[PDB]
Amino acid sequence: YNIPFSPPDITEAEITEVVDTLRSGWITTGPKTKELERRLSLYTQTPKTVCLNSATAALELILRVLEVGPGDEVIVPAMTYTASCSVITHVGATPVMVDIQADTFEMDYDLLEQAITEKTKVIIPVELAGIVCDYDRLFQVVEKKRDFFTASSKWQKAFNRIVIVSDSAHALGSTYKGQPSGSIADFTSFSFHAVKNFTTAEGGSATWKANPVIDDEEMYKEFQILSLHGQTGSWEYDIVTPAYKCNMTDIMASLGLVQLDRYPSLLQRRKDIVDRYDSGFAGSRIHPLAHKTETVESSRHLYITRVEGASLEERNLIIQELAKAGIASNVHYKPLPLLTAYKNLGFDMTNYPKAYAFFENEITLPLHTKLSDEEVDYIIETFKTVSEKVLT
Amino acid sequence: YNIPFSPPDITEAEITEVVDTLRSGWITTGPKTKELERRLSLYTQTPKTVCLNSATAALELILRVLEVGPGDEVIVPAMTYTASCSVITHVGATPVMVDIQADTFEMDYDLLEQAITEKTKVIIPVELAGIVCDYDRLFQVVEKKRDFFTASSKWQKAFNRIVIVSDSAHALGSTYKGQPSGSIADFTSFSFHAVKNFTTAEGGSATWKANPVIDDEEMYKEFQILSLHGQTKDALAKMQLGSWEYDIVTPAYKCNMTDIMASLGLVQLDRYPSLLQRRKDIVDRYDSGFAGSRIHPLAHKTETVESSRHLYITRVEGASLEERNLIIQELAKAGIASNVHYKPLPLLTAYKNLGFDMTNYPKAYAFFENEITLPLHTKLSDEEVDYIIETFKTVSEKVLT
Ligand SMILES: *Cc1c(COP(=O)(O)O)cnc(C)c1O
Ligand SMILES: *Cc1c(COP(=O)(O)O)cnc(C)c1O
């Protein structure tokens, strides 16, 4: 066994669709990107979707639309990927980190209330492993602190509150109380990066739920303008703002079209693998995050586990013992304050003890659609034997 | 029959290379991007090349490596594409626009000297249509104003002068006094966008000429770090069998090139000398066609320059703004797509809103007023060129009194 962590799942159907684009007159943004956006909108139950070159691009663009900028604050969990936070610093806003709960990755929503100020413009929860956050709660928090809010831009007037922007890089296809991810938070960004559930090798999207206060075409145009240098017998164009360059090509969209056709089948397989893993670890010290709750049906992107009674050293040893057995594994995630970039900005790990405690004993097992049932069986058994073995 | 301005030139060889990447374990950055960077470095005579997802990305990262920022100034010509200027505002620097000469797109190098201040960190000349700028002159200017300069970052100490950063979006393959574009200016960004000479549909690169004061590996690593979220991994974690552990040194960007785009680039680069030759043949046919007429093309062959021949920029003698715009619409009625390179930056809403005023760059405006760009791409047949030549001549004269 040599089990990789997240190989891409690409078949001939994807290759023929890309080849088709390469024989067309449209190799960058064109008809298949528009078609992809249409079909993703239907899938996520949103009116419009903007397809871009990364989820990092989408998330940033969302901030840029809301015109979040210097002196504004944006709240992120301490336990997340660097990308959710980096974009806050790109627009010149100030990140505010919120520690997490004891038995989940989700922010402590009391600490979230306490973190909110008159500067607070946006909250970016992360839908880690595909597991969507407690949005009933999150929407209660922003309504509750709604008098703190003052709208300093066009779109901030439309909402008269903190905008909730979902980092659903892991959560295309997840649902919360039966609704698709993308239709829950005010804005949502998705990732189609090589290692994600749905891939275009590099890509992503921004979308937003139906809301009477948003003209959808106008919002789409605004995203488009910012993604293509601010540009608006037809030679003549103007440039309204010296903007960015993060459009999606029809090469990536071709991949996306086919992935989206195959996607219900990929999800089902990831359900089967997660359920086998779940049975395997029941009764053991290995405690997976739950992909099926009363409110959530996860996309089942990552098999996040934590090992009861493991220290930092013991965890790091377990991972290296897993690789000796031919099992690649990962850690999601170092809390942001462990990272040099965020220490240099004054964030300190001792302020987020729960985030640190989640990270210390966390191990992510392979969860992708090229795993065989026998490989899963092998992972279950080896992980159990290796954990117990890590001993003195 | 209807002639497009810039269709992409893609063959089966490109398609088989992309398919090959799509069957590999590497669909984003991987072995073919590294190989592309290696082969482009050889082609441009530079030690290293960083392949990215746009020339806009490359140009901005060059500025971010030089740590050009708030309170610094960066000089660009008034006659250029918005991308050359936008990246200045992205790093928080202040753009300074310089008007151009009377008979070419190049900046007026006297006005350039006059524009330079103690804040001036970078000059971004544009190699318009593939025509490389007068770099002997440009380097004379920055040496001449070298006492104005004070170095407020690591790489600004390495140079102790204004850094010259070539916008060669149009100029992969162009040469200035026999040297490739990329080896002339201090840094150079290239574009592999769909409509460019060499395409990856979307893409580009940053490179830099050999200079004793630059550790090339260190400069590469710095670009790489900024293109991939600031992520690094130490020697220890890389050696370990499970190499999970990484640090993030700076909350950086996301503009790496995939091996899908690199696959395109590898094949394009093989086919490139042949694409260049064809663009030479088309330009020469056009050149003969317009000789003696009121249609005046920019020259792709000078005593110092052999252009890549990316755009057939022309200006029509004695045409006003209205007459030009009418000529272009008459060209489309005849089935000939055409374009304008470029509206001077100060005509654009974004740059007016930042206080730039068109009346300060009268030569830039005068270049734009009567400029028309004809199709110049490797899907044009000789008969289509013949047709363009004749129609453009007849339509221009038609537009009389
Ligand atoms: C991968 C990832 C992103 C950014 O995705 P890209 O498409 O690579 O920009 C953002 N957030 C999270 C949680 C991720 O895992
Ligand atoms: C197209 C272009 C750019 C930027 O190219 P991308 O690869 O689209 O970022 C920059 N400068 C000039 C002159 C261009 O034509």
Numbering used by the authors:
A (entry chain B): 4 to 235, 245 to 404
B (entry chain A): 4 to 404
From the paper:
Spr1654 is involved in the early steps of TA precursor synthesis, where the first amino sugar UDP-AATGal is suggested to be synthesized by this aminotransferase, followed by several TA biosynthesis pathway steps. The three-dimensional structures revealed that Spr1654 has a fold characteristic of the type I aminotransferase family. Two dimers, composed of subunits AB and CD, are present in the asymmetric unit of all the obtained crystals of all forms of Spr1654, with a buried surface area of 2490 Å2 per monomer (15% of the total solvent accessible surface area).
In the crystal structure of the Spr1654/PLP complex, the PLP-binding sites are located at the bottom of deep and wide cavities formed at the interfaces between the subunits. The aromatic ring of PLP sits at the deep end of each cavity. Clear electron density confirms the formation of a covalent bond between PLP and residue Lys199 in Spr1654. These interactions enhance the electron sink nature of PLP and maintain the cofactor in a protonated state, which is a typical feature of the aspartate aminotransferase (AAT) type 1 enzyme family. The deprotonated O3′ of PLP is at a hydrogen-bond-forming distance from the side chain of residue His173, which preserves the negative charge of O3′, and stabilizes the protonated internal aldimine of Spr1654. In addition, the phosphate group forms two hydrogen bonds with the side chains of residues Ser194 and Thr59 in Spr1654, as well as water-mediated hydrogen bonds with the conserved residues Glu205 and Gly206.
